[PDB]
């Protein structure tokens with residue numbers, strides 16, 4: 001039903017629209033790292049998220065480093081599993097080249113180009129797919145002009161050779177916070193969005209204002225990862241401020257994916273330790289974060 005309704009997504013004047021030029025707002029879940037918590041990423045869990053939560057997008061977080069694709073590329077099969085499930089379930093899917101410790105996207109540029117060539121050849125004809133080419137550039141000397149924009153200008157043509165139209169999400173500096181710098185020096189490709197990531201327990205009004213500056217320059221923004229906890233993971237969840245961010249995103253119709261669908265014992269995790277990997281969760285199997293996020297997606301489903 002989701003993709004049947006919306007079809008091919010595109011960017012129109014800085015925001016995400018469907019095949020009729022209607023606003024569309026994607027809300028869903030990110031996996032945790034696929035090399036760690038892949039058991040939660042399967043057709044049955046994603047069908048449960050679609051049917052019980054109301055998700056219309058699922059994000060497959062394929063770490064590069066940290067034991068991910070660079071060391072054990074078999075994890076790409078878990079990405080394929082997620083994409084094929086999303087196609088079968090008629091929802092959107094984000095293929096995320098999940099850089100983090102490898103903080104400069106140029107570390108694994110050759111590998112990223114090969115990976116995105118393969119993924120876009122396989123899936124580029126499906127409107128379901130969204131590419132996220134570098135999760136979180138970070139560090140004081142990884143900047144838009146020197147490192148990130150040129151990386152994107154090399155990877156995007158690789159995708160476009162196979163998939164001229166699907167959305168590409170491009171990370172920004174300072175853990176995908178520096179959307180203002182990207183907005184002042186935008187990519188030419190018309191169907192790109194810039195990532196903005198936050199933690200409710202850490203980030204506040206000054207970053208909302210930074211996002212608004214970017215939006216004011218005509219840049220499209222996808223909140224492709226956010227957490228209900230603090231970035232430190234201390235002090236529980238911060239749902240008061242999370243609701244402030246939910247409202248902010250709704251008022252700007254910003255799409256989002258929440259971090260993350262795992263049973264790890266950390267406050268951002270959506271599930272309690274032991275939760276069934278194939279879905280069908282009881283209310284006792286959702287964490288406080290998961291309970292809140294589920295309600296946020298349900299109430300617009």
Ligand SMILES: CO[C@H]1O[C@H](CO)[C@@H](S[C@@H]2O[C@H](CO)[C@@H](S[C@@H]3O[C@H](CO)[C@@H](S[C@@H]4O[C@H](CO)[C@@H](S[C@@H]5O[C@H](CO)[C@@H](O)[C@H](O)[C@H]5O)[C@H](O)[C@H]4O)[C@H](O)[C@H]3O)[C@H](O)[C@H]2O)[C@H](O)[C@H]1O
Pocket residue numbers: 036066100136175177197198199202203231232264266268
């Ligand atoms: C003034 O404010 C501004 O400057 C501030 C100072 O620099 C920063 S604070 C800064 O914020 C950033 C952005 O939020 C974060 S990075 C952030 O951290 C998250 C929490 O760690 C992670 S998700 C997290 O990823 C972990 C690493 O992979 C894993 S632990 C990992 O788990 C596996 C599996 O179990 C295990 O095998 C491994 O052994 C473990 O290492 C964890 O489970 C995940 O939840 C997110 O990806 C990242 O964005 C900085 O930490 C923080 O200091 C302000 O942000 C800025 O505005």
Ligand SMILES: [Ca+2]
Pocket residue numbers: 010011012013190
């Ligand atoms: Ca357009």
Ligand SMILES: [Ca+2]
Pocket residue numbers: 013014015252
């Ligand atoms: Ca807008």
Ligand SMILES: [Ca+2]
Pocket residue numbers: 069070071072073
């Ligand atoms: Ca390798």
Ligand SMILES: [Ca+2]
Pocket residue numbers: 035072
């Ligand atoms: Ca492995």
Ligand SMILES: [Ca+2]
Pocket residue numbers: 117118121
């Ligand atoms: Ca090729």
Ligand SMILES: [Ca+2]
Pocket residue numbers: 124125126127163164165166
């Ligand atoms: Ca396409």
Ligand SMILES: [Ca+2]
Pocket residue numbers: 154
């Ligand atoms: Ca080059």
Ligand SMILES: [Ca+2]
Pocket residue numbers: 215216217218
């Ligand atoms: Ca404007």
Ligand SMILES: [Ca+2]
Pocket residue numbers: 250
């Ligand atoms: Ca509301």
Ligand SMILES: [Ca+2]
Pocket residue numbers: 025250253
């Ligand atoms: Ca909306």
Ligand code: NA
Pocket residue numbers: 070071072073
């Ligand atoms: Na290897």
Ligand code: NA
Pocket residue numbers: 013014215216217218
């Ligand atoms: Na505008």
